[PDB]
Design an enzyme around this catalytic site. Structure first.
Site, mmCIF file in Angstrom:
data_model
loop_
_atom_site.group_PDB
_atom_site.id
_atom_site.type_symbol
_atom_site.label_atom_id
_atom_site.label_comp_id
_atom_site.label_asym_id
_atom_site.label_seq_id
_atom_site.Cartn_x
_atom_site.Cartn_y
_atom_site.Cartn_z
ATOM 1 C CE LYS A 172 -3.794 0.962 -1.417
ATOM 2 N NZ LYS A 172 -4.527 0.214 -0.356
ATOM 3 C CB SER A 189 -1.000 0.003 1.153
ATOM 4 O OG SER A 189 -2.097 -0.840 0.838
ATOM 5 C CB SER A 233 -4.791 0.925 3.227
ATOM 6 O OG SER A 233 -3.416 1.218 3.308
ATOM 7 C CD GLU A 255 -4.123 -2.768 -3.437
ATOM 8 O OE1 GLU A 255 -3.291 -2.024 -2.878
ATOM 9 O OE2 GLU A 255 -4.214 -3.998 -3.198
ATOM 10 C CE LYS A 304 -1.600 4.116 2.578
ATOM 11 N NZ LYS A 304 -1.365 2.762 3.132
ATOM 12 C CB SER A 305 2.047 1.418 7.091
ATOM 13 O OG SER A 305 0.648 1.294 7.224
ATOM 14 N N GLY A 306 2.303 -0.344 4.711
ATOM 15 C CA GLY A 306 1.840 -1.365 3.797
ATOM 16 C C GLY A 306 2.163 -2.740 4.345
ATOM 17 C CB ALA A 307 0.658 -5.378 5.612
#
Ligand SMILES: [Ca+2]
EC number: 3.5.2.6
Lengths: 263, 165
Positions: A48, A45, A105, A141, A209-212
């Site tokens: 984004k 993510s 997200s 996505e 902005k994080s993501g997994a």
């Protein structure tokens, strides 16, 4: 500070996987610390931000409008669409989509935005044109989170991402208005609490902005600084680990604590 | 008092007021306003970048408004997922809910979104089902083989799938 690298090496040993790390001086753009800076990692993510960056670029040129409403339907929904699912009947504006994409997200929000710019290929083209010949988006996505080992689709390099983030946030690429909008959405990020934010001293400023993703992929890009003002860009990515979300969230926070400590 | 859960979701009925919803889901787990307008959004355990959740819609903003839409992600687990790409392709627009279930497996789906545009009347009810294959579902991580099937008045209007084999 080298003590941070000790924590990074520690994290790799803990999760049994590669950990890319970048600490950039916001003003100069010089590297303050780096680790596996040219190793590829799934963006998850964190892409984004780059997406809404391309979106803002179009708004500047007047090819797009912040209040342009988009009407989607059931066919557009993909897993994890908390905001877009709620506005299914009402629809959402481009502005509201970027807010949802970055601050929550929202997966469907991202796809819709990708649609307004011509798809993944166009985001990549946008990146190439601004000097980033590494970062690439290939899928939509939710497939872009597959994180297949050695697969380069939808990946970036810590150094390429930090530099690009810096260009979007402080470059002349975007108007001061867009830069401020991009930073504001990132500042309003509400789904990255267990990471860097968890070590942030009161009064500090942070836009992130994080993501997994699959295969223990985890990451976060950010612009932070004390006394309510950003002064450094930080980028952290890991992949391949079998560790649990909590363990991975822990290692990332610890790196953040060190980073904050020796600031 | 426990985060939002599947049992709480099911316990909540259409027609209930915000207070009834909050007392069941647990006020601390929910929020309103912002990106969710006047709907009530409650969170369950961590699930990737966010959490598993439920979003409850209401007839109006009033305190005496009633629930007219229930939506949830990762709160309900399929009881016996048997969906497959072959089975998915056998589904056809126009089938009734019964016919779809007979195609994708009696225990392959969970309700994703249920809305009554003319509440208290059931006319026009739209339903979105999220169905999974043997290991597609997950309450925390990403799906590995799922499908979205939506209906209006019990009749299938469309379908779409991800990673089914
Ligand atoms: Ca599967």
């Amino acid at each position: 500070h080298p003590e941070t690298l000790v924590k990074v090496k520690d994290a790799e040993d803990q999760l049994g996987a590669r950990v890319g790390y970048i600490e950039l001086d916001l003003n100069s753009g010089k590297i303050l610390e780096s680790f596996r800076p040219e190793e590829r990692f799934p963006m998850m993510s964190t892409f984004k931000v780059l997406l809404c960056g391309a979106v803002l670029s179009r708004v500047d040129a007047g090819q797009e409008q912040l209040g342009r409403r988009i009407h989607y339907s059931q066919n557009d929904l993909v897993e994890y669409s908390p905001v877009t699912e709620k506005h299914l009947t009402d629809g959402m504006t481009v502005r509201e989509l970027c807010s949802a994409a970055i601050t929550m997200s929202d997966n469907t929000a991202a796809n819709l935005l990708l649609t307004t710019i011509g798809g993944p290929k166009e985001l990549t083209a946008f990146l190439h044109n601004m000097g980033d010949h590494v970062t690439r988006l290939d899928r939509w996505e939710p497939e872009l989170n597959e994180a297949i080992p050695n697969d380069e689709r939808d990946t970036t390099m810590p150094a390429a991402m930090a530099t690009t983030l810096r260009k979007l946030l402080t470059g002349e690429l975007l108007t001061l208005a867009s830069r401020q909008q991009l930073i504001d959405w990132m500042e309003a990020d509400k789904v990255a609490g267990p990471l860097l934010r968890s070590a942030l001293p009161a009064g500090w400023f942070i836009a992130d902005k994080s993501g997994a993703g699959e295969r223990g992929s985890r990451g976060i890009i950010a612009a932070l600084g004390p006394d309510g003002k950003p002064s450094r860009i930080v980028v952290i990515y890991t992949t391949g680990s079998q560790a649990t979300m909590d363990e991975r969230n822990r290692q990332i926070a610890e790196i953040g604590a060190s980073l904050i400590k020796h600031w | 008092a426990g985060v939002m859960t599947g049992a709480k979701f099911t316990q909540i009925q259409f027609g209930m007021t915000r207070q009834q919803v909050l007392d069941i889901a647990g006020a601390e787990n929910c929020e309103t306003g912002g990106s969710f307008g006047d709907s009530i959004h409650c969170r369950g355990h961590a699930a990737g970048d966010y959490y598993a959740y439920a979003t409850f819609g209401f007839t109006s903003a009033a305190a005496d408004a009633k629930v007219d839409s229930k939506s949830q992600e990762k709160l309900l687990a399929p009881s016996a997922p048997t969906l497959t790409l072959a089975k998915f392709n056998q589904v056809t627009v126009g089938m009734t809910r019964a016919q779809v279930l007979a195609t994708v497996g009696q225990g392959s789906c969970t309700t994703w979104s249920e809305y009554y545009p003319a509440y208290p009347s059931t006319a026009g009810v739209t339903l979105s089902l999220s169905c999974f294959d043997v290991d597609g579902y997950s309450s925390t991580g990403a799906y590995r083989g799922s499908a979205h099937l939506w209906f209006t008045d019990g009749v299938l209007q469309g379908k779409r799938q991800w990673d089914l084999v």
